[PDB]
PDB file of N, CA and C in Angstrom:
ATOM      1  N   UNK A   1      39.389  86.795  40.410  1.00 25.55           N
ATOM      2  CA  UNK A   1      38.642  87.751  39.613  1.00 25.55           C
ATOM      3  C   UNK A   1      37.674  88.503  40.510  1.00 25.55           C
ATOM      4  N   UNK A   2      37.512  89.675  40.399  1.00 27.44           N
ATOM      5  CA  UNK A   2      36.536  90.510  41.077  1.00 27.44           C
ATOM      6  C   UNK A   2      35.237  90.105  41.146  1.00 27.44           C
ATOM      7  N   UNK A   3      34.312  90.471  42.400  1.00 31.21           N
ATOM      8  CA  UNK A   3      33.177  89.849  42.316  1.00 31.21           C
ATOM      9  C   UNK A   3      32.939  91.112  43.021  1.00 31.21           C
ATOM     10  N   UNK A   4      30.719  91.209  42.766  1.00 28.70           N
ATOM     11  CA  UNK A   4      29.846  92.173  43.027  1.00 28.70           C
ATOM     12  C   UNK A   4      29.423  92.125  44.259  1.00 28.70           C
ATOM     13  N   UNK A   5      29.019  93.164  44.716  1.00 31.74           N
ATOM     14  CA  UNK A   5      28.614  92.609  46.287  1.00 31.74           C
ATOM     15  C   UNK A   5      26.718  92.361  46.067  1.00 31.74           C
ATOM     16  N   UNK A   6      26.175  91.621  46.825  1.00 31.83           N
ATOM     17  CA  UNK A   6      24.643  91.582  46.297  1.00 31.83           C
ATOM     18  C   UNK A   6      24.116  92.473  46.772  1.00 31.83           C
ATOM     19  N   UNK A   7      23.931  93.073  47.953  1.00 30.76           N
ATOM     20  CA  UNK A   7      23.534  94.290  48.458  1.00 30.76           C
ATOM     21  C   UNK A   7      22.903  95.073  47.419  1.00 30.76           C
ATOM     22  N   UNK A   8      23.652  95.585  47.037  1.00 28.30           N
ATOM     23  CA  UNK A   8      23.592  96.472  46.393  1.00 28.30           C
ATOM     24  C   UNK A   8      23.756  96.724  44.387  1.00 28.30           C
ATOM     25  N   UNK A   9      23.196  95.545  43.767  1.00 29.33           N
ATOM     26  CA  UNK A   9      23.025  95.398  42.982  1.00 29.33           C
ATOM     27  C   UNK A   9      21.540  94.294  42.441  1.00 29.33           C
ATOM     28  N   UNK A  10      20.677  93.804  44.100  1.00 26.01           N
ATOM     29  CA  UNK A  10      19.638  93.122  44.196  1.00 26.01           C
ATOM     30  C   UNK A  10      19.320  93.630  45.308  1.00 26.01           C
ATOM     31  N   UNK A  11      17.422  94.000  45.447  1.00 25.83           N
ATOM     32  CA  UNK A  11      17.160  94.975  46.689  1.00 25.83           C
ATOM     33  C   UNK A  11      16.436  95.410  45.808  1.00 25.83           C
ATOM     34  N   UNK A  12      15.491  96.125  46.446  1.00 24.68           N
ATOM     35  CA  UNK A  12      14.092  97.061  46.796  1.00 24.68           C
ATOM     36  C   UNK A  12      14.497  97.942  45.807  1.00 24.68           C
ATOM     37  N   UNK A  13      15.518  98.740  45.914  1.00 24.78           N
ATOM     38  CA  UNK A  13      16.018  99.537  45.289  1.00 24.78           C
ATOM     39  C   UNK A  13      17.026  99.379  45.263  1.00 24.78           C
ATOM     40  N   UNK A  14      17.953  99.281  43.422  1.00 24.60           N
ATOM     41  CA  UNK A  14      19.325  98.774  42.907  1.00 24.60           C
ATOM     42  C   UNK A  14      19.906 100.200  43.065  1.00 24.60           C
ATOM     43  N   UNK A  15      21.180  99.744  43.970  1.00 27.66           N
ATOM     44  CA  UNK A  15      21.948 101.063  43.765  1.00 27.66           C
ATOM     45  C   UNK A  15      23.299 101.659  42.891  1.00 27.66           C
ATOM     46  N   UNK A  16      23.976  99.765  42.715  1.00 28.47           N
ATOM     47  CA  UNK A  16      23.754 100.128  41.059  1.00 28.47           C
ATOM     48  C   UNK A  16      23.774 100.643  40.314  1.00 28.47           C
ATOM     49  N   UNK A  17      22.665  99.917  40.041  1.00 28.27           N
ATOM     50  CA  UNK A  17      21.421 100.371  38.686  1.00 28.27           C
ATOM     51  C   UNK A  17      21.605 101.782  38.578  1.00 28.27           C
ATOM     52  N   UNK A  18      21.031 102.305  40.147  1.00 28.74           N
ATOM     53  CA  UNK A  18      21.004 103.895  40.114  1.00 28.74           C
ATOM     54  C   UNK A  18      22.332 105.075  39.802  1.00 28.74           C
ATOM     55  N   UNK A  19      22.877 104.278  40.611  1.00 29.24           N
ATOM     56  CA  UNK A  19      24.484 105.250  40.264  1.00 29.24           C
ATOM     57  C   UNK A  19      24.622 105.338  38.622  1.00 29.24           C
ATOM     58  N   UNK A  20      24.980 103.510  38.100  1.00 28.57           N
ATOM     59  CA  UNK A  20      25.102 104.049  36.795  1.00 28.57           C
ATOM     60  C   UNK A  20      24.016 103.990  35.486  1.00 28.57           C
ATOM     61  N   UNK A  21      22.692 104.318  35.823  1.00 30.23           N
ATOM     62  CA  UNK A  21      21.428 104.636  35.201  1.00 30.23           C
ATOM     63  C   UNK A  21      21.488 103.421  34.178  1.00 30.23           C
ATOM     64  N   UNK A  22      21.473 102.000  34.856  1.00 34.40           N
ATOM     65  CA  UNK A  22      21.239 100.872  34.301  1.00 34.40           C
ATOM     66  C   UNK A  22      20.103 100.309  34.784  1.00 34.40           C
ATOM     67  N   UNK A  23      19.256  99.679  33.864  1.00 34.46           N
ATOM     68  CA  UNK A  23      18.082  98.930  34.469  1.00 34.46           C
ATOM     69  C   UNK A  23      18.517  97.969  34.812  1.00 34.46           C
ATOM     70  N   UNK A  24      18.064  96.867  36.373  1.00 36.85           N
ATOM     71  CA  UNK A  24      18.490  96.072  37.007  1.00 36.85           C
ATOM     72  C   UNK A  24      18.807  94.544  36.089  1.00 36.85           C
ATOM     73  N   UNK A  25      17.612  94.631  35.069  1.00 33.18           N
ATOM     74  CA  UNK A  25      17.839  93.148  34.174  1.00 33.18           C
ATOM     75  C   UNK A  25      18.798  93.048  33.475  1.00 33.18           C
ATOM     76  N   UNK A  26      19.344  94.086  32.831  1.00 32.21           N
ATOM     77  CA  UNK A  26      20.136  94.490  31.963  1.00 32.21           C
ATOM     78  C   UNK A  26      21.732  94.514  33.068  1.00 32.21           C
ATOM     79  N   UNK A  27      21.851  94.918  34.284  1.00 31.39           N
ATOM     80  CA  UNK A  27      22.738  94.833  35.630  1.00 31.39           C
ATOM     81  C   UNK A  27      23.331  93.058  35.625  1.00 31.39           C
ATOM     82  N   UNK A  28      22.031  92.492  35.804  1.00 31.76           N
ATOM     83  CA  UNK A  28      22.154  91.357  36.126  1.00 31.76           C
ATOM     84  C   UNK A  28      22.579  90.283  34.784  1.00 31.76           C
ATOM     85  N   UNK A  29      22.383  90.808  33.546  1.00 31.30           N
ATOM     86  CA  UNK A  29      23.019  90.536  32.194  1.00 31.30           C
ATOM     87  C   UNK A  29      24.069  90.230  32.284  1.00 31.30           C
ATOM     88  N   UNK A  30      24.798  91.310  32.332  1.00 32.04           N
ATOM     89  CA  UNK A  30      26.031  92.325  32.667  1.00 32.04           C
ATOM     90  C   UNK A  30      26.962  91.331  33.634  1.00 32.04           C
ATOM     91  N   UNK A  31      26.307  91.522  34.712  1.00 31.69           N
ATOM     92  CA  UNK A  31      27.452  90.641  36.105  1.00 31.69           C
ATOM     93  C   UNK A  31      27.098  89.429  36.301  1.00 31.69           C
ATOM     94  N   UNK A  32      26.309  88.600  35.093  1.00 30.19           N
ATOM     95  CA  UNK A  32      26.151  87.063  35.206  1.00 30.19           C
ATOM     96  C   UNK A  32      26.583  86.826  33.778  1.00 30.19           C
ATOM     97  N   UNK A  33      27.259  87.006  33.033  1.00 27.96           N
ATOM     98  CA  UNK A  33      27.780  86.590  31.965  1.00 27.96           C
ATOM     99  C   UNK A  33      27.381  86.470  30.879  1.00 27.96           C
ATOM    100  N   UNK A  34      25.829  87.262  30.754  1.00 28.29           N
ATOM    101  CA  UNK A  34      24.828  86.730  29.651  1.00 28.29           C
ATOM    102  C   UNK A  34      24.803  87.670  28.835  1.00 28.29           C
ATOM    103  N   UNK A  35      25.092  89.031  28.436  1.00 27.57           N
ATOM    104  CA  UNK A  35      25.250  90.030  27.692  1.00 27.57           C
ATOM    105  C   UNK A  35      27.008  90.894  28.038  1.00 27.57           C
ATOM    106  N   UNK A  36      27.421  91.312  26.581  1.00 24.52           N
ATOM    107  CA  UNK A  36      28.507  92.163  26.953  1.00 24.52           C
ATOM    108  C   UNK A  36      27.845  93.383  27.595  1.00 24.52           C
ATOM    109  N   UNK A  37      29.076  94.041  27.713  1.00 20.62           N
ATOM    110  CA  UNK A  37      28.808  95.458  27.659  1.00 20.62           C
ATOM    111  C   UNK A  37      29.764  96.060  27.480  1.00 20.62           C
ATOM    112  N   UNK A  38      30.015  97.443  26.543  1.00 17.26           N
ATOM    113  CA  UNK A  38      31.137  98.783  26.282  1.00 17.26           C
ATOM    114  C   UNK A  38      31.482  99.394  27.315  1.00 17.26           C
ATOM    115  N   UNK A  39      32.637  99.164  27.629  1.00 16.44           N
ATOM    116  CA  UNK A  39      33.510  99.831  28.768  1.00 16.44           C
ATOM    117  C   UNK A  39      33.704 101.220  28.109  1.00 16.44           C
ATOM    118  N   UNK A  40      34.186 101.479  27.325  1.00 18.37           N
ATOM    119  CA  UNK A  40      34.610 102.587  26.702  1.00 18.37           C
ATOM    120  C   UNK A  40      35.045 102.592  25.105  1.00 18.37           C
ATOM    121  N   UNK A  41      34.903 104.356  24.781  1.00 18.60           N
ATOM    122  CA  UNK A  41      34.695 104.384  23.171  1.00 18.60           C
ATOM    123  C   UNK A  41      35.613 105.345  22.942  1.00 18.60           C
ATOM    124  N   UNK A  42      36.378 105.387  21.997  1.00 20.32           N
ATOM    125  CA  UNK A  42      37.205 106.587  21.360  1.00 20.32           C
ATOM    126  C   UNK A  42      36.288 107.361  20.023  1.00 20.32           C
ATOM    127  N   UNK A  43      36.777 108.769  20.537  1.00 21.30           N
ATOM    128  CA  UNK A  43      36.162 109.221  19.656  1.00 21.30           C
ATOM    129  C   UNK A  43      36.581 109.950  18.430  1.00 21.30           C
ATOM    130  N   UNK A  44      38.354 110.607  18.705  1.00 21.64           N
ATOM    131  CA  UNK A  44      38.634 111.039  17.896  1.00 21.64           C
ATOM    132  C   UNK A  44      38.932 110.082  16.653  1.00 21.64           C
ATOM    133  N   UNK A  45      39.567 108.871  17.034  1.00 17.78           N
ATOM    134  CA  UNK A  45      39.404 107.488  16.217  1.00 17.78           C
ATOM    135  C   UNK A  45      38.529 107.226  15.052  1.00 17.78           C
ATOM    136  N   UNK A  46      37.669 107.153  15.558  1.00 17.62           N
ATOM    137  CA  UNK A  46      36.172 107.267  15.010  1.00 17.62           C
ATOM    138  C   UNK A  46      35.799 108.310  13.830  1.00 17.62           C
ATOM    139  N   UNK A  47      35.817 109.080  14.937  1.00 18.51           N
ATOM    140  CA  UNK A  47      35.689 110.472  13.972  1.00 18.51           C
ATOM    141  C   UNK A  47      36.503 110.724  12.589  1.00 18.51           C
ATOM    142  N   UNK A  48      37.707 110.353  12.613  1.00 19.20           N
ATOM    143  CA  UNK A  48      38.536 110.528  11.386  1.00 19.20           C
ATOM    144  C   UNK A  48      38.270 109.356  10.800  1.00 19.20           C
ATOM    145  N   UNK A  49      38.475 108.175  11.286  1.00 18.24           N
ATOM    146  CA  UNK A  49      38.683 107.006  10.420  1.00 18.24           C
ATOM    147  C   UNK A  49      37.016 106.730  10.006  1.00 18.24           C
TER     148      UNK A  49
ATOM    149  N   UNK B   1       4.869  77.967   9.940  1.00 15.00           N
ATOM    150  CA  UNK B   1       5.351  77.136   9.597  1.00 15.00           C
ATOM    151  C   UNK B   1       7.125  76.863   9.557  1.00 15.00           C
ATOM    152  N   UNK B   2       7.947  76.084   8.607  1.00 15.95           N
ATOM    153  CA  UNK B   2       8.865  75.940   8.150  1.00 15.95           C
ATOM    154  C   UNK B   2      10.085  76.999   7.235  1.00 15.95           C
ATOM    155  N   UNK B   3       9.089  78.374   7.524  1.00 20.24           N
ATOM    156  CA  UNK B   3       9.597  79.546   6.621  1.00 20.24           C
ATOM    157  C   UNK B   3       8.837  80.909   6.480  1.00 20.24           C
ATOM    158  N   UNK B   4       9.134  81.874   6.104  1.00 16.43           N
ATOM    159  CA  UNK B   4       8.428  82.985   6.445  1.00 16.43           C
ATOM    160  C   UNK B   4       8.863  83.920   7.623  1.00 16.43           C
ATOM    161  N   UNK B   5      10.097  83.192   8.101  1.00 18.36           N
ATOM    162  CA  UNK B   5      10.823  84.145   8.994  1.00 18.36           C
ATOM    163  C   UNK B   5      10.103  84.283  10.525  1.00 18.36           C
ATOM    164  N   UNK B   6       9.157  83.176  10.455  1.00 20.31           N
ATOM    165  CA  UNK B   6       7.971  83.122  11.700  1.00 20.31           C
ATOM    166  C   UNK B   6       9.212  82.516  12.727  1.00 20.31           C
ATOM    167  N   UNK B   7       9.458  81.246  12.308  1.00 19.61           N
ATOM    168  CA  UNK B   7      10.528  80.165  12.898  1.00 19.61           C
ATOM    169  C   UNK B   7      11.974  80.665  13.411  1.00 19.61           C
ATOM    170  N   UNK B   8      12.345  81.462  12.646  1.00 20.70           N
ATOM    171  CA  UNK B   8      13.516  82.147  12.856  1.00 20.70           C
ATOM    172  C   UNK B   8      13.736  83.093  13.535  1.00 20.70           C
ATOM    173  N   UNK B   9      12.676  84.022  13.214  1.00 21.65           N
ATOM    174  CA  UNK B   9      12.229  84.877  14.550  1.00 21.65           C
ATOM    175  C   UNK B   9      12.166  84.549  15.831  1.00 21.65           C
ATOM    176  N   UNK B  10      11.266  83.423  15.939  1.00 19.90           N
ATOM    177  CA  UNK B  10      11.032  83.129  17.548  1.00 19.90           C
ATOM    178  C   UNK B  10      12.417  82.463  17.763  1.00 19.90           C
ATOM    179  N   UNK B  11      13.097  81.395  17.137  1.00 19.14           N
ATOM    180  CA  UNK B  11      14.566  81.103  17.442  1.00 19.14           C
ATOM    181  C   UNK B  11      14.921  82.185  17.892  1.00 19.14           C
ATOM    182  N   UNK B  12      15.691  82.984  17.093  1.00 17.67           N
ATOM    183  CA  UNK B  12      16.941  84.776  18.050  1.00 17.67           C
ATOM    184  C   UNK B  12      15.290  85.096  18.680  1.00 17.67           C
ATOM    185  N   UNK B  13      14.456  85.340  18.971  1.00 15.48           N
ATOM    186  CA  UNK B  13      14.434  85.726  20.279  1.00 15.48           C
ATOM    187  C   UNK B  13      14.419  84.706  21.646  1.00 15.48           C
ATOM    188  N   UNK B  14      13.773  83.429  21.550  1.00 13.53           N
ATOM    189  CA  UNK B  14      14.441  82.715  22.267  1.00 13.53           C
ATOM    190  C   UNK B  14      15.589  82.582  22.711  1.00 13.53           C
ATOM    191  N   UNK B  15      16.942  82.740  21.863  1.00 16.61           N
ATOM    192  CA  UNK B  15      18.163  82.475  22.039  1.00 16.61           C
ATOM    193  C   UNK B  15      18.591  83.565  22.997  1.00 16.61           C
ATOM    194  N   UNK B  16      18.033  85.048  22.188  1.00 16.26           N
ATOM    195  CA  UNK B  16      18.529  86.385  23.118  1.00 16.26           C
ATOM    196  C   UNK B  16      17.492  86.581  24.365  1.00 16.26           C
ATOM    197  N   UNK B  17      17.496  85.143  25.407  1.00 17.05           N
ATOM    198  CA  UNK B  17      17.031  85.230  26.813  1.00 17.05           C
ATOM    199  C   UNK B  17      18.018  85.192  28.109  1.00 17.05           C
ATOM    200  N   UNK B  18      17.351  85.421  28.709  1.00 16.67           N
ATOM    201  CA  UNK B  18      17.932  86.074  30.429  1.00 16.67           C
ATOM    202  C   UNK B  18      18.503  83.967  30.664  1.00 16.67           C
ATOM    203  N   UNK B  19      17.503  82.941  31.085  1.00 15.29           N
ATOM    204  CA  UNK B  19      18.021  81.926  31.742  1.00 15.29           C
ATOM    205  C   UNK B  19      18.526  81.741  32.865  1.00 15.29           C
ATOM    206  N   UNK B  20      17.728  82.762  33.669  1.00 13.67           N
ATOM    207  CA  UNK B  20      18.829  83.366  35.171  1.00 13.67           C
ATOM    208  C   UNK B  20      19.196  81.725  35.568  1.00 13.67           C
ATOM    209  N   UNK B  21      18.780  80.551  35.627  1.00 13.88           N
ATOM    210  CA  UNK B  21      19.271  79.152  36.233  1.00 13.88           C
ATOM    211  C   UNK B  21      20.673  79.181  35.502  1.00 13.88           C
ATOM    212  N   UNK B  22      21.487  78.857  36.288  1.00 12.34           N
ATOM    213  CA  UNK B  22      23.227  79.088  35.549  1.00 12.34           C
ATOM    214  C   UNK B  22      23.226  77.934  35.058  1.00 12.34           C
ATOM    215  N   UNK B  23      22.671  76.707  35.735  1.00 10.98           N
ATOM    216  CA  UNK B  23      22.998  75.286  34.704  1.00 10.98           C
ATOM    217  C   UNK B  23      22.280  75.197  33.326  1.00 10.98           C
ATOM    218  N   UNK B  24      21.681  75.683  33.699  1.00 13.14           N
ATOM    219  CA  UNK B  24      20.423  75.623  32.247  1.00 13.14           C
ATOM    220  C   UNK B  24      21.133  76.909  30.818  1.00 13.14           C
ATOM    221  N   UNK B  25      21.294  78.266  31.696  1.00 15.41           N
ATOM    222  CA  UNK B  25      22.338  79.007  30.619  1.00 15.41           C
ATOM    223  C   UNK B  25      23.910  78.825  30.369  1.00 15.41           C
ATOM    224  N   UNK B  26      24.541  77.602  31.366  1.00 13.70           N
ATOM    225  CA  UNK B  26      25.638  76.822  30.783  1.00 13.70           C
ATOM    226  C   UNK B  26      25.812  75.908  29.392  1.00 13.70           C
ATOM    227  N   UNK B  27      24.444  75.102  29.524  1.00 11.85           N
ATOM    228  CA  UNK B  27      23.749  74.244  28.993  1.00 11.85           C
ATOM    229  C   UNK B  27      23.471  74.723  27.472  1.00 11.85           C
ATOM    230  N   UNK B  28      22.745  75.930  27.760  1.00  8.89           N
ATOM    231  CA  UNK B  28      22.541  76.335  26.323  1.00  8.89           C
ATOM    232  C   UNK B  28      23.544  76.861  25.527  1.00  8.89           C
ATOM    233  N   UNK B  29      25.095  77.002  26.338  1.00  9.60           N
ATOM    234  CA  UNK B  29      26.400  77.907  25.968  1.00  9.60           C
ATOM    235  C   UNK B  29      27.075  76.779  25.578  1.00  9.60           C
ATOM    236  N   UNK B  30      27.124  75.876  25.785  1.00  7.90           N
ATOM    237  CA  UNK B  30      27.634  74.746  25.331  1.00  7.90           C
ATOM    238  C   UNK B  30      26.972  74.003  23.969  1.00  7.90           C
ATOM    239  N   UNK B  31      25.496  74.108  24.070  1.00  6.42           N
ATOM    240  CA  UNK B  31      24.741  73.842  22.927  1.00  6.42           C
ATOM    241  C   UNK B  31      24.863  74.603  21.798  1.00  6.42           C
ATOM    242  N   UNK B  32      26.196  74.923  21.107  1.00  6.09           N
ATOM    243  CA  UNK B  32      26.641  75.870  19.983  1.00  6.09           C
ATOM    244  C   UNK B  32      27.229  75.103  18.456  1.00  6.09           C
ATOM    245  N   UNK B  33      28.505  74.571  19.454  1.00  5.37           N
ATOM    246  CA  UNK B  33      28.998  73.915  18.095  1.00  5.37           C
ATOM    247  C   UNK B  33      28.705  72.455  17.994  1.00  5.37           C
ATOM    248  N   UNK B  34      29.121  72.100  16.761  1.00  7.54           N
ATOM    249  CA  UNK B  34      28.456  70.943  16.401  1.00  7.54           C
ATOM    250  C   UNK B  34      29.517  69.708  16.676  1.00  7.54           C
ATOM    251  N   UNK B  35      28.887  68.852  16.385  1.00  9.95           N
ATOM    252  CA  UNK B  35      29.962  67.440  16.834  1.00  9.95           C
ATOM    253  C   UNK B  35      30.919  67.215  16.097  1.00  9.95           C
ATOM    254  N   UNK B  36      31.975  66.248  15.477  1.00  8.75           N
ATOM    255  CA  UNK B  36      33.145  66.045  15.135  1.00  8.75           C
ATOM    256  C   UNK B  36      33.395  64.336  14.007  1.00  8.75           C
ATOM    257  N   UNK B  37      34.053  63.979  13.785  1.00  6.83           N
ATOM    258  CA  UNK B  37      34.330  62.796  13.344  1.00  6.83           C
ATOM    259  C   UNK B  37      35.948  62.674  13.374  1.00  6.83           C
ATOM    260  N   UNK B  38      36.112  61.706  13.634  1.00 10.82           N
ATOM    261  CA  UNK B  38      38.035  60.979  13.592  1.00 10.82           C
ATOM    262  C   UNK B  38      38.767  61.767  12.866  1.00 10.82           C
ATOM    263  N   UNK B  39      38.041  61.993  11.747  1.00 11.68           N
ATOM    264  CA  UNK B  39      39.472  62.572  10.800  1.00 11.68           C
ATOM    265  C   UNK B  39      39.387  63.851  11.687  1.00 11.68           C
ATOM    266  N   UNK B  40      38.531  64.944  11.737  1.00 12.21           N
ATOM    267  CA  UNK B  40      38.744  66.194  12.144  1.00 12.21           C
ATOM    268  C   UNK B  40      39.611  66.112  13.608  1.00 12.21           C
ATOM    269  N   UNK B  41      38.978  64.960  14.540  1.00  9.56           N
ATOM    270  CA  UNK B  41      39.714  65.154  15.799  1.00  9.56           C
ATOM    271  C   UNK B  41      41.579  64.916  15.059  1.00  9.56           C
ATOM    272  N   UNK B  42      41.778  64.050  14.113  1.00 13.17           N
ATOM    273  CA  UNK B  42      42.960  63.799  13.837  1.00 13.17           C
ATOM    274  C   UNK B  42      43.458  65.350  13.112  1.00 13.17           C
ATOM    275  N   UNK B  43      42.992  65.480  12.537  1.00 11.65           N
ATOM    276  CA  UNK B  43      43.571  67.266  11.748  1.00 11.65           C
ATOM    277  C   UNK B  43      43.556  67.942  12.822  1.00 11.65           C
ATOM    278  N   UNK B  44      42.548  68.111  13.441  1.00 11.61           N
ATOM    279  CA  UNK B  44      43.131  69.319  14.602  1.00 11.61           C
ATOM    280  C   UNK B  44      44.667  69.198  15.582  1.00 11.61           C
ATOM    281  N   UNK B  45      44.784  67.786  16.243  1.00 14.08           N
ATOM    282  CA  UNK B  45      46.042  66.924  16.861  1.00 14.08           C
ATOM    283  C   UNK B  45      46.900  67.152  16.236  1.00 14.08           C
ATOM    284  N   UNK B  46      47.081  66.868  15.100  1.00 10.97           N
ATOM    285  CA  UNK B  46      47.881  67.863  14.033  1.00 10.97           C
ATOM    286  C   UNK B  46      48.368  68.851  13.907  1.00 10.97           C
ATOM    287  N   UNK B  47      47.160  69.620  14.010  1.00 10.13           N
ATOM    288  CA  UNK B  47      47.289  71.292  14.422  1.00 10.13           C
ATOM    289  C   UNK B  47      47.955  71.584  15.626  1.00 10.13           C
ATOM    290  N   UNK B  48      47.500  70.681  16.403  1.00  7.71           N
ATOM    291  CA  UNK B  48      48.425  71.246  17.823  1.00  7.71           C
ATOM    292  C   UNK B  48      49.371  70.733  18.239  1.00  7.71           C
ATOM    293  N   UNK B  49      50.001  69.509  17.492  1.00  7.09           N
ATOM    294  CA  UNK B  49      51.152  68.882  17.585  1.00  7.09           C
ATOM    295  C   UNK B  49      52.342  69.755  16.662  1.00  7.09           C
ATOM    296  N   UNK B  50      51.629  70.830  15.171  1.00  3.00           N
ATOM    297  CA  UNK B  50      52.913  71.514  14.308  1.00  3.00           C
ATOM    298  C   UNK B  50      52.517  72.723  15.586  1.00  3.00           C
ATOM    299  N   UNK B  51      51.814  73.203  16.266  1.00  2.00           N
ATOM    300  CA  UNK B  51      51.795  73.888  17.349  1.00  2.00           C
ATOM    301  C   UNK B  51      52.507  73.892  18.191  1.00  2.00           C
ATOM    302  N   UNK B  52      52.600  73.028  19.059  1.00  2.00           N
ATOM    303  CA  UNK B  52      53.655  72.769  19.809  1.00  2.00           C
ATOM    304  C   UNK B  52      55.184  73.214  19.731  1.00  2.00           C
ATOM    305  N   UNK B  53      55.245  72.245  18.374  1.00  2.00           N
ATOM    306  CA  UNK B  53      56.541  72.200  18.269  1.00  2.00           C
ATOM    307  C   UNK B  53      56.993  73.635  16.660  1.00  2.00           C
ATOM    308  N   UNK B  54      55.915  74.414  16.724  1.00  2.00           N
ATOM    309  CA  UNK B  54      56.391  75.451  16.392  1.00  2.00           C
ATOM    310  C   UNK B  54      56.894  76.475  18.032  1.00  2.00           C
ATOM    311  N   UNK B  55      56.125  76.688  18.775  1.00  2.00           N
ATOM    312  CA  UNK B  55      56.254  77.263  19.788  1.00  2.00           C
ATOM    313  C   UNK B  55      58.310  76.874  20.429  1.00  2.00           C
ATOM    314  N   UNK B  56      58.134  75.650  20.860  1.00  2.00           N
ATOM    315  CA  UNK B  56      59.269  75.183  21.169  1.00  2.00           C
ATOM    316  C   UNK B  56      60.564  75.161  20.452  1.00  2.00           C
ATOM    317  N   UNK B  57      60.343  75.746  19.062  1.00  2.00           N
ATOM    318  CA  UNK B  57      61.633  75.404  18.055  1.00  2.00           C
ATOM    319  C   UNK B  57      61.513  77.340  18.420  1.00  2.00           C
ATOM    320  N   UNK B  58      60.415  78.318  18.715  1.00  2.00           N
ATOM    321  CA  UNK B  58      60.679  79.548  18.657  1.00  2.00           C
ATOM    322  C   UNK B  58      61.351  79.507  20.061  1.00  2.00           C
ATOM    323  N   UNK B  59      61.214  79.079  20.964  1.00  2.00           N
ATOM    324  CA  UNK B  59      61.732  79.009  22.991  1.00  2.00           C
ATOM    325  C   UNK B  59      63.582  78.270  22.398  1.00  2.00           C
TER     326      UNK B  59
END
């Protein structure tokens, strides 16, 4: 299974975080197993149904 | 006290914590469901014994 590199997701400044405008706690949620998160949403789906 | 939504409150927010120690938020991931008695372990064995051999009569 894929794994994160630490570099760059722990540090002074998360880069990350920054690329995808996530706060680092919420990062670290995320890539330690403790919160989901939405990969992606349909919308026309939605929209009609 | 015992009610008033004081108790319950602080429970979900306790529950919805970080735990960065992985043994300790293993610990609490495991601390979910509840325990068992004979008959249930026997009904479930059950379950996975007409399991089985549903699978194998479909192969």
């Amino acid at each position: 299974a894929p794994v994160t590199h630490i570099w760059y997701f722990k540090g002074v400044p998360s880069r990350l975080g920054y690329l995808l405008d996530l706060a680092p706690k919420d990062l670290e949620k995320i890539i330690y197993f403790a919160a989901y998160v939405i990969t992606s949403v349909d919308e026309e789906m939605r929209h009609n149904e | 006290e015992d009610e008033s939504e004081a108790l319950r409150q602080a429970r979900k927010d306790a529950e919805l914590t970080a735990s960065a120690d992985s043994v300790r938020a293993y610990l609490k991931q495991i601390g979910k469901v509840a325990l068992l008695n004979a008959e249930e372990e026997v009904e479930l064995a059950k379950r996975i014994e007409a399991g089985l051999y549903a699978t194998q009569l479909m192969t």
